[PDB]
Amino acid sequence: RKIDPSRGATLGDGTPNDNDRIEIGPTQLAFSEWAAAGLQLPNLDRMREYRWKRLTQAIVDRGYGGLLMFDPLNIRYATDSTNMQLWNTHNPFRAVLLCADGYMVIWDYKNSPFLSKFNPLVREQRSGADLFYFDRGDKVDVQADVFANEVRVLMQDHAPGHTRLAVDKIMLHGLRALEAQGFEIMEGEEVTEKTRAIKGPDEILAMRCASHACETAVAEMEKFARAHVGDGKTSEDDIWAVLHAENIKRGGEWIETRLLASGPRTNPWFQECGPRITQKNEIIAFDTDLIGSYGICVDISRTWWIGDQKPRPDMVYAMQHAHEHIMTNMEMLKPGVMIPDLTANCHRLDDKFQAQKYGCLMHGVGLCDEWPLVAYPDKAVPGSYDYPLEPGMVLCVEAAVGEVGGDFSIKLEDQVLITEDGYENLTTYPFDAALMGLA
Amino acid sequence: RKIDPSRGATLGDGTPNDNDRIEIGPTQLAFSEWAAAGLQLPNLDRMREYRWKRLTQAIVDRGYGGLLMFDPLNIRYATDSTNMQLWNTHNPFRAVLLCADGYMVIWDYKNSPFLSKFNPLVREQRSGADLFYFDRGDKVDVQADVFANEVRVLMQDHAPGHTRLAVDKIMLHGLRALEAQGFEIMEGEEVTEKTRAIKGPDEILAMRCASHACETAVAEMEKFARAHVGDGKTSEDDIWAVLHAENIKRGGEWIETRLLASGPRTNPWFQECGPRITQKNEIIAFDTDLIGSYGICVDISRTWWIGDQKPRPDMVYAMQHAHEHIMTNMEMLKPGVMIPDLTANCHRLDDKFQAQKYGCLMHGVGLCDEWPLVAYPDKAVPGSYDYPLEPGMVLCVEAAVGEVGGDFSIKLEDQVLITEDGYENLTTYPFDAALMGLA
Numbered sequence: 001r002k003i004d005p006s007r008g009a010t011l012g013d014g015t016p017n018d019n020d021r022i023e024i025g026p027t028q029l030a031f032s033e034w035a036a037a038g039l040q041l042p043n044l045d046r047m048r049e050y051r052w053k054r055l056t057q058a059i060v061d062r063g064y065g066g067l068l069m070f071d072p073l074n075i076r077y078a079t080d081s082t083n084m085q086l087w088n089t090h091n092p093f094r095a096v097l098l099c100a101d102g103y104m105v106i107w108d109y110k111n112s113p114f115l116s117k118f119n120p121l122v123r124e125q126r127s128g129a130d131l132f133y134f135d136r137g138d139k140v141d142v143q144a145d146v147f148a149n150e151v152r153v154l155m156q157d158h159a160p161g162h163t164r165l166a167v168d169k170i171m172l173h174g175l176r177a178l179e180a181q182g183f184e185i186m187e188g189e190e191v192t193e194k195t196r197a198i199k200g201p202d203e204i205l206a207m208r209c210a211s212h213a214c215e216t217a218v219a220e221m222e223k224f225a226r227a228h229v230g231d232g233k234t235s236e237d238d239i240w241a242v243l244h245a246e247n248i249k250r251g252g253e254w255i256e257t258r259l260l261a262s263g264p265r266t267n268p269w270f271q272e273c274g275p276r277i278t279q280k281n282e283i284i285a286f287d288t289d290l291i292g293s294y295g296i297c298v299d300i301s302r303t304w305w306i307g308d309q310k311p312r313p314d315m316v317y318a319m320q321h322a323h324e325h326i327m328t329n330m331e332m333l334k335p336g337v338m339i340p341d342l343t344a345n346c347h348r349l350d351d352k353f354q355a356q357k358y359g360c361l362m363h364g365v366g367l368c369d370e371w372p373l374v375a376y377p378d379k380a381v382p383g384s385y386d387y388p389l390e391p392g393m394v395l396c397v398e399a400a401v402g403e404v405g406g407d408f409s410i411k412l413e414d415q416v417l418i419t420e421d422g423y424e425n426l427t428t429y430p431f432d433a434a435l436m437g438l439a
Numbered sequence: 440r441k442i443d444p445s446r447g448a449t450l451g452d453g454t455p456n457d458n459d460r461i462e463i464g465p466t467q468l469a470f471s472e473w474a475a476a477g478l479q480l481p482n483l484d485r486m487r488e489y490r491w492k493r494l495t496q497a498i499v500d501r502g503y504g505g506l507l508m509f510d511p512l513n514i515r516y517a518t519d520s521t522n523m524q525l526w527n528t529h530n531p532f533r534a535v536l537l538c539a540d541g542y543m544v545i546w547d548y549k550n551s552p553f554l555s556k557f558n559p560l561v562r563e564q565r566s567g568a569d570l571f572y573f574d575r576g577d578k579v580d581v582q583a584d585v586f587a588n589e590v591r592v593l594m595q596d597h598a599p600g601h602t603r604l605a606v607d608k609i610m611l612h613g614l615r616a617l618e619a620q621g622f623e624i625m626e627g628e629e630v631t632e633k634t635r636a637i638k639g640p641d642e643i644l645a646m647r648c649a650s651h652a653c654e655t656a657v658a659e660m661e662k663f664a665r666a667h668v669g670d671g672k673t674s675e676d677d678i679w680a681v682l683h684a685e686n687i688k689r690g691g692e693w694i695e696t697r698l699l700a701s702g703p704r705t706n707p708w709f710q711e712c713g714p715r716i717t718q719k720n721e722i723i724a725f726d727t728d729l730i731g732s733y734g735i736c737v738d739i740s741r742t743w744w745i746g747d748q749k750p751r752p753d754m755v756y757a758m759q760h761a762h763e764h765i766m767t768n769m770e771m772l773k774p775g776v777m778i779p780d781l782t783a784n785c786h787r788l789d790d791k792f793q794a795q796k797y798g799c800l801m802h803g804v805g806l807c808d809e810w811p812l813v814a815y816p817d818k819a820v821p822g823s824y825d826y827p828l829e830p831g832m833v834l835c836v837e838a839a840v841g842e843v844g845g846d847f848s849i850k851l852e853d854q855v856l857i858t859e860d861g862y863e864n865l866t867t868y869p870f871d872a873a874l875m876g877l878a
């Protein structure tokens with residue numbers, strides 16, 4: 001019943017070597033590629049304990065009694081348990097309570113309590129935290145009270161004396177029911193974002209794996225693009241579909257955006273991947289925004305030139321400017337640097353690129369986009385992110401370069417770990433040799 | 440430059456025949472399959488007007504002054520405009536206000552105001568509704584007040600005298616800011632769910648197309664599964680990956696769950712698609728949970744047998760019982776039937792299948808799963824869905840059939856339109872011959 005005949009009772013990440021197990025994860029395909037690349041696998045048990053310990057400590061540090069989580073990404077961080085993640089993002093059927101003493105309860109889908117049993121840090125599997133109109137119609141309120149009473153009892157038993165309960169996001173019916181139980185509702189995101197910002201050693205290992213899988217998937221997509229672009233039928237969607245499939249084949253989870261565009265659709269940026277028929281001798285730019293293997297986000301961006309002619313000089317300049325932008329800004333990264341100083345000292349894009357520059361020069365990343373957000377000086381708000389970088393943070397470093405009314409933009413982005421004494425760029429994906437002007 | 444040379448200034452759905460347009464939509468692949476299949480296309484303009492008029496009226500009928508929407512699915516309904524939908528589901532950066540006079544405003548991503556300009560019913564494009572920690576850190580509160588003030592002014596101008604504002608779901612900072620402006624916050628979902636429950640003519644056309652694209656994609660997946668299952672390497676993820684790609688190739692959007700499982704991983708149901716290596720002489724069951732072409736959800740389930748042997752006796756019976764379940768239940772459907780009567784009179788599953796039956800026998804569907812939810816008698820809550828079916832509603836009819844401790848389950852489901860006279864099963868996907876006891 002082993003899924004890997006070559007191993008003993010456990011896989012390299014410590015999970016059961018059992019083809020019929022409930023728990024999912026990276027595929028044999030992914031494991032083989034990582035092994036061949038000499039990547040160390042994370043130990044999931046140790047990873048889960050690390051996250052749980054850190055999240056409990058965050059609650060304690062703030063003087064709160066507990067943290068209640070409805071965002072599926074927070075639930076994933078706390079428990080490492082998935083359940084229809086994407087459905088969950090807009091249907092709040094699920095909840096995790098983590099109390100100050102570390103006691104953790106999940107309210108799951110009624111039918112699927114077994115989905116988090118692989119994590120013994122989840123002490124109970126309940127149901128009935130689904131407080132929205134589709135699931136309960138005109139009787140949300142009655143169950144909202146049942147749920148809030150359950151939270152009151154758990155908090156009485158596991159955080160006695162505490163009235164402060166942090167909540168990331170909760171339906172209005174839930175909010176009221178909790179407030180009626182005497183809780184003072186605190187900002188859960190301030191707790192979760194700052195906790196998730198520091199990755200432990202296994203999370204970094206998992207991220208190295210996800211990044212490799214993502215670059216492999218992207219490589220397949222580039223092969224497909226260069227082979228098929230300009231054949232009169234291949235569309236943006238056709239190319240992008242390769243990324244989707246190659247991600248899923250490696251045990252990835254979803255893609256957050258539609259950020260792949262061709263030709264004049266790259267400017268302005270943020271136009272979505274669609275039916276456009278791609279053309280020979282045009283730019284194609286994209287952003288992975290990918291929730292990949294082990295549920296880790298890999299958020300990188302590349303711009304390709306595909307054609308029999310040379311890219312225009314203005315395209316080469318833009319690309320080199322973009323590359324310079326991220327390499328300069330990345331070099332600012334080391335422990336102890338204050339976020340607003342990254343803002344104040346960032347590489348200056350030429351005037352003609354300023355109007356359409358990206359919404360940030362950097363941002364955190366983990367299970368998805370995460371705190372912090374490092375804004376350009378003209379958008380930065382004083383007092384918003386007054387904190388220093390620390391080892392174990394991971395920041396994506398961004399560049400969007402294009403002119404107002406122009407017919408192309410460049411998007412580049414690399415994913416960068418903060419180390420004990422500087423940074424390590426985790427992204428190894430090539431830059432288009434033609435656009436870089438290296439021919 | 441036309442994307443479809445065989446056409447004039449517009450595509451068959453009235454959108455601009457322009458390869459370089461901002462607006463996305465179904466691909467030429469999709470339009471080709473639909474033309475061959477004989478399908479009439481929706482007129483998107485009329486569809487958008489129908490939804491808007493209907494939602495405005497819902498606000499008027501309730502005596503509210505406005506409806507404020509942060510759920511990307513409600514934003515999609517109101518405006519038909521997408522923007523990083525999946526990111527949006529857990530990052531509330533976006534909002535739409537619809538006022539009692541039909542005046543409609545969107546707060547979009549700062550960088551991407553152009554994304555909804557194709558819908559002139561969207562009267563303004565603003566920014567600054569992003570009230571969450573990642574985007575604003577310790578300065579959410581200040582923007583929350585700027586935003587709440589903007590909402591107040593709009594409501595003063597477009598719904599004077601109204602202090603009732605329906606909101607679907609909003610971060611706590613936003614809620615407090617709106618209440619500080621004098622609004623009584625009403626349940627937005629009660630408005631959106633009931634409005635979306637009745638599809639206009641163009642939405643029905645869109646859904647027929649989406650249903651065809653989805654069934655085509657599922658066909659590719661079945662082809663793959665039957666050719667490759669049991670080759671010692673093909674995993675659940677490999678098979679499922681085909682659905683992802685084939686959906687995207689036709690202008691689809693995402694998949695809400697991971698509900699495809701093989702062999703003993705189908706019981707209990709709700710185990711997620713993963714690395715499991717598939718086998719000959721086994722069941723593969725799945726649920727599309729698919730957000731497809733035109734952004735329309737197609738939610739159907741099929742169970743397959745793949746092997747050289749024949750299905751066990753208990754498997755064939757389970758399948759017949761399941762098919763009988765949905766066909767009996769479907770017969771209940773016609774305008775005027777009260778939801779709680781669907782519950783009361785539903786097909787009775789054998790004692791052995793009761794413990795693990797589905798969470799509902801039916802539910803609505805449109806842009807995703809939608810009101811109503813039709814529970815089985817033992818879970819139905821009095822006074823939750825006291826409403827009659829009406830023409831234009833669409834319900835999926837569900838069957839989950841398996842024994843406690845069993846080694847397989849059957850999952851079947853069809854998507855059914857409610858007509859003036861009765862029902863029309865939109866789903867034409869074959870049922871597995873061998874499981875049905877045929878050949």
Ligand SMILES: [Fe+3]
Nearest residue numbers: 287288289299
């Ligand atoms: Fe990104």
Ligand SMILES: [Fe+3]
Nearest residue numbers: 299396398413
């Ligand atoms: Fe990014």
Ligand SMILES: [Fe+3]
Nearest residue numbers: 726727728738
């Ligand atoms: Fe489904």
Ligand SMILES: [Fe+3]
Nearest residue numbers: 738835837852
């Ligand atoms: Fe369903």
